[PDB]
Amino acid sequence: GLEVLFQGPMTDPVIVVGAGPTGLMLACELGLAGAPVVVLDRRDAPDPHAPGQAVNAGVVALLEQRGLADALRASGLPLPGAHFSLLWLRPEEITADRPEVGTGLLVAQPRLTEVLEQRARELGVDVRRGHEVTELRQSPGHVTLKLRTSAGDSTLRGSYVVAADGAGSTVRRLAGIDFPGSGWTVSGIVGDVTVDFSELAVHHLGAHYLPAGGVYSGAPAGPGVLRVITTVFGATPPAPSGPVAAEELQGEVEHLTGQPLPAREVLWARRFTSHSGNAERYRSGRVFLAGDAAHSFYPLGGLRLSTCLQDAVNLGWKLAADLAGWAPPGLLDTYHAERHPEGERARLALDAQLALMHPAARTAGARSLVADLARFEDVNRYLVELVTGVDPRYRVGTDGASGSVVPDPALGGRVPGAAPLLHGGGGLLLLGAADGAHARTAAAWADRVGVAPALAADATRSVLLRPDGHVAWAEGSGSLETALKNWFGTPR
Amino acid sequence: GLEVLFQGPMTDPVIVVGAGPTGLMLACELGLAGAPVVVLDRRDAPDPHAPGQAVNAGVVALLEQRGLADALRASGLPLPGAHFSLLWLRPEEITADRPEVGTGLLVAQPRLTEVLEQRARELGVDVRRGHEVTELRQSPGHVTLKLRTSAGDSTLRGSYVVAADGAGSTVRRLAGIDFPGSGWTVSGIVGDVTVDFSELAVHHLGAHYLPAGGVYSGAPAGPGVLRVITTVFGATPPAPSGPVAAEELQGEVEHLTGQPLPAREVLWARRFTSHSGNAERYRSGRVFLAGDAAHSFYPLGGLRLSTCLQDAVNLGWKLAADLAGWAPPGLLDTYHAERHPEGERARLALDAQLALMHPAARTAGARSLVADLARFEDVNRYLVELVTGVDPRYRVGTDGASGSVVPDPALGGRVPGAAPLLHGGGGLLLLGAADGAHARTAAAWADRVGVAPALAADATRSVLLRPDGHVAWAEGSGSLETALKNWFGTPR
Numbered sequence A, B: 001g002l003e004v005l006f007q008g009p010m011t012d013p014v015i016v017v018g019a020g021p022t023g024l025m026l027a028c029e030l031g032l033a034g035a036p037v038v039v040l041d042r043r044d045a046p047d048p049h050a051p052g053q054a055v056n057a058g059v060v061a062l063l064e065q066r067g068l069a070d071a072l073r074a075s076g077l078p079l080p081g082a083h084f085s086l087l088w089l090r091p092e093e094i095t096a097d098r099p100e101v102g103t104g105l106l107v108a109q110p111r112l113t114e115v116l117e118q119r120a121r122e123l124g125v126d127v128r129r130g131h132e133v134t135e136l137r138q139s140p141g142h143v144t145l146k147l148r149t150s151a152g153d154s155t156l157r158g159s160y161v162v163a164a165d166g167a168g169s170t171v172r173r174l175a176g177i178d179f180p181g182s183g184w185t186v187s188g189i190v191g192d193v194t195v196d197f198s199e200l201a202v203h204h205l206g207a208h209y210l211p212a213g214g215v216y217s218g219a220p221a222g223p224g225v226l227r228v229i230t231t232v233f234g235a236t237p238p239a240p241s242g243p244v245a246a247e248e249l250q251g252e253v254e255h256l257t258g259q260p261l262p263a264r265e266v267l268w269a270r271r272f273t274s275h276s277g278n279a280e281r282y283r284s285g286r287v288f289l290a291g292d293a294a295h296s297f298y299p300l301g302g303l304r305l306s307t308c309l310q311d312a313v314n315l316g317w318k319l320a321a322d323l324a325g326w327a328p329p330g331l332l333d334t335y336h337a338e339r340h341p342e343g344e345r346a347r348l349a350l351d352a353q354l355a356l357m358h359p360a361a362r363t364a365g366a367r368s369l370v371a372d373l374a375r376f377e378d379v380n381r382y383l384v385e386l387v388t389g390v391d392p393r394y395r396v397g398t399d400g401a402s403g404s405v406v407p408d409p410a411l412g413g414r415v416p417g418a419a420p421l422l423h424g425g426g427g428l429l430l431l432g433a434a435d436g437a438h439a440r441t442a443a444a445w446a447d448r449v450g451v452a453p454a455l456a457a458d459a460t461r462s463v464l465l466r467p468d469g470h471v472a473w474a475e476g477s478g479s480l481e482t483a484l485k486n487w488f489g490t491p492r
C-alpha cells in the first residue's frame, strides 16, 4: 500500500510494451506531444546484439524531423547504394530529383536504440526494465496489464496499450490477433566475428546473392568486428533457433562463398528464423500493434526498421491528440487504415525479392527478367523508392479527406526539406505565394498548427503537414479549412 | 537390288527427320532454295491431335515472307491480345509503331502443318511416312541412317541430317547431345470436348491463371469443339503421361475453375509433361537439331512454335548455300551461334513466367511486382515484343560481321514490310535514296541477291536482307560490299 503514497497526481499513461526501436520512437513521439507514457521491457538492459545495420532513408527522414539524425550519423557510414533482391540499382539517377534517397546509413541497431533512449530520458519518459507483460484486460475506459518483475506479480493501468514487443509479440497473442502471411519462412545465422579487415577477400565484404541459392553479408560493426549474416535457402537448419558455434557459422560461410573467414574468434552467433506476417488488425479497442509486432518478414534490406518507425510516428501524435481531447472523430482509426496496407506492401515486397532467389535453379529466369527490366529508368526509380522507404503515400482526397476512394496523388506524401522545421512537433502550414488568406484560416488552429515559409522547406506552394510529416493538403487540392478540420479537429 | 534401277541421277539429300511444323517448314525452305531434301516421319499420317492453337506474330512473319500466311488465316481467328505469365499486356500501345505485333492467330496446329505440307508437295518434296529412324552413323562426307518401316529395316544416305523429331528427339539422343535446363517440369491435360458454346460460363473461355496455383485454357477448335488445357501446379499427377478419361479432365477443370464443363463428350484427352531444355549444341558434324529437338519448355503462349520455325528458316538457306557451293566460310556455324542463345532466351522466359505462378502463395508478391512494373510503357513494350516472338535480333557488327563483340543495334532484326518481296527466296537489297553505287556493288552478287525499292517495303534507307529476312547491313553500318561477302560469299 505504502508504494501509492507521495507520488502525486497521475493521468492514465499510454503503456508501450517493448523498448526496442519501435517502442522508444513511439515514446519519443508521445513525450514530445505531451502525452503521458510508460515504457516496459522484459530485458534487464539494452540488447548489445540487436542485429540490424541497414538504416534506410525512410528511417533517417523520421529521425531528421526530430533532430535525432546527427546523433545516429556519428556512429554510421553513408550507404548510398540500393538493391532489390540483391540486384544493384542506380539511386544516383534520381538523387538530383530526390536527395532523400541517398541518406541511408550503415549503423549498428543498438546505436539507434541508444539515440532514441537518450531522447526519451530527456523528455522524462519512464523506462521500466525487468518488467514482463503476462496478461491484458480491457475495460471501456482503460486497460490493465499483469506484469512480472524479480519482486513478483503486479498490475498497471493505462489509457492505451501499444504492442511494440517484436515479431513474436506477447500482446498480439493476448489480444487474439492473427498474423497471416505467405509461408515464406527463412532461416539464417547472424553473429559478430573478430577479424583483421585487411585480410578479408573482397567476397567477404558487402551483401551477395550466391547463384547456388543463398545470401552472405559481411559488414564492419566496430573496430576489428565483422557482422556476418548467412542464409542457405532450402537447407533445413540443424535447429530453427538457438546459439551457434564457430564451426557452424564457418561451415555456412564456406559453403556459400567457397572460403571460411579469417576469424580470430566468433564473439557471438545465433540461428534466426524469420516469419512472414502482417497482423489482421493493428487496433483492438484500446490495444494497438506497431513495428515487428504488426508485421514481419526476412530482413534483406532496411524495410523492417522503416516500417517500424513509420508506424510509431503515425500513431504517437494521434494517441496524443485523442488523449488531449482535440482529435477529429475517427483519427485513431486512421492508424490501421494507413499503416496496415503499408505493412502488407513491405511484407509482399520481401516475398517478391525472395521469389527471385529460391529455389535458385527455378527462379534464375525471373531474376534475369527483373535485372533486365531494372535497366529502364522508371523501373529503377520504382525499385529504388521502394527499397529506400521513401515511396509511402497515404490515401488522402480533396480537402484532406482521409481514406478517399478518389485519392489526390499530390497528397499523403512528404516534404523532406521541412524536417528541420518540425523538431518542436505539431502540425505545420508551409506558406507559399503560388496561387493573406491561408495564414488567416490557419489562425483558428494556431494551438495545433505552426506556420513557416514554403521556401524554408524547398516547397514551391502552400502545403499542410500533419505532425507525422505527411501532407494533408496543398494549394490546388481543395479547401485548407476543411483539411484543418479533417486532421486537427474543431477551430479554437 | 531392283529398287535401285530406273531412278536416275540423285544428289545426297538433306534428310529431315520429322514432319511436324519444324520439319516441314525446313523442307519448304530447302525446296524453295533448290536443295535436295527428303522428309521422314514415323507416323502413318498427320497427327489430328497436334495440340497447339496460339500462333504468334513471329510465326506469321515467316509464313508471310513465303506467302503461306493467307492459307493459315483462312482457318484462324485474330488473337490481338498478349500476355506474360497470363498477366494481360497492352500490345495496342505499340502496334502503331510495330503493326507486326498484332498479327497473331488462334488456329489449330494441324492446319499449320497442313499448309506447310501442301507447300512442300508443290515444291516436289518427298515425305516418307511410316519411316522411323533407329540409328545414325556419320562419315566425313555424308551421313547414313538406319530406318524401320512395315516392310523392315533399311538404310538412307544424306549430305546432312536435321533432327526435327520433337522434344524427346531420337536424333539428339543418337548424337549424344545433352539437353540441360532449370528443372521446371510441368504436367497438364490437353483434350477436345464437345460443347454448346452458348452454355459456357465466361470463366470456361480464354486462358486464366487461378490464384490457387494452376492454369485453365478453353478455346474453340472447330464447330462444337472446345480445346481445353488444365495444369494444377505442385499436384503430382496420377501418372506423367498417357490417355485421360472424362472424369479426370472434368476433375481438374472443376478443381481449378470451381465448375465442370457442360460437356456432351470428351473426344480425346491426354496427360502431357513438359521438360525445360536447350540442347548444348545445335550442330554435331553433319547433324543439326531444330525445333523442339533443340529446345523445350511449357507451352504457355506461342514461343514454342515461333522458336521452331525461326530455327527452320535460319537453317534452310544456309544448308542450301553450303550444298550449292557459294556459302561463305563458317556460314553453317552461324546456325548454332544465332539460334542456341535464342532457344535459351525463350526457355528462360518460360522459367520466368512459371516462377510468377508456382508455388502460388510464395510467388504472389513477385507476380504483383511484375504486374505493377507492366504499367510502365517501356516494360509493356519489352514484354509484348518478347511474347509475340518479334524481338529476336542477331548479333551482327559493322560491315555485316557475324557474331561481333561490338554488335550494331541497327542490324540483325527484320523489315516486316519486305515480306511480300521475299516469296521467291534469295537475299534482297532494298534500295533507298537516304545518304547509283549500291545497285552497282550488289550486281556482282545478282545470282544470290535481288533488288527492290526500300519504299516498297516501308523502309526509309538501303538495307540488305539475308534469305531468312534478317538484316545483314543498312546504310550507315559500314561497307555493303563487305556485308555481301560475309553472308553471300565471293563475287560472281
Ligand SMILES: Cc1cc2nc3c(=O)[nH]c(=O)nc-3n(C[C@H](O)[C@H](O)[C@H](O)COP(=O)(O)OP(=O)(O)OC[C@H]3O[C@@H](n4cnc5c(N)ncnc54)[C@H](O)[C@@H]3O)c2cc1C
Pocket (backbone or CB within 6 Å): A017, A018, A019, A020, A021, A022, A023, A040, A041, A042, A043, A050, A051, A052, A053, A054, A055, A109, A131, A132, A133, A134, A164, A165, A166, A167, A169, A170, A171, A189, A190, A229, A272, A290, A291, A292, A293, A299, A301, A302, A303, A304, A305, A306, A308
Ligand atoms: C539477423 C537480423 C538482421 C536484421 N537486419 C536488419 C537491418 O539491417 N535493417 C533493418 O531495418 N532491420 C533489420 N532487422 C530487423 C530488426 O532487427 C527489427 O525490425 C527490429 O528489432 C524491430 O524492432 P521492434 O522495436 O519492433 O522490436 P524488437 O527490437 O524485437 O524489441 C521488442 C522488445 O519487446 C520486449 N518484449 C517482448 N516481449 C515482452 C513482454 N511480454 N513484456 C515486455 N517486454 C517484452 C523485448 O525485450 C524487446 O526489447 C534484422 C533482423 C534480424 C533478425
Ligand SMILES: Cc1cc2nc3c(=O)[nH]c(=O)nc-3n(C[C@H](O)[C@H](O)[C@H](O)COP(=O)(O)OP(=O)(O)OC[C@H]3O[C@@H](n4cnc5c(N)ncnc54)[C@H](O)[C@@H]3O)c2cc1C
Pocket (backbone or CB within 6 Å): B017, B018, B019, B020, B021, B022, B023, B040, B041, B042, B043, B050, B051, B052, B053, B054, B055, B109, B131, B132, B133, B134, B164, B165, B166, B167, B169, B170, B171, B189, B190, B229, B272, B290, B291, B292, B293, B299, B301, B302, B303, B304, B305, B306, B308
Ligand atoms: C498441350 C500442348 C499445347 C501446346 N500449345 C502450343 C501453342 O498454342 N502454341 C505453340 O506455339 N506451341 C504449342 N505447343 C508446342 C507445340 O505443339 C510444339 O512446339 C510443336 O509440335 C513442335 O513441332 P516440331 O515439328 O518441332 O515437333 P513435333 O510436332 O513433335 O513433330 C516431330 C515429328 O517427328 C516424328 N518423329 C519422332 N521421332 C522420330 C523418329 N525416330 N523417326 C522418324 N520420325 C520421328 C514424330 O512422329 C513427329 O511427327 C503445345 C504443346 C503441348 C504439349
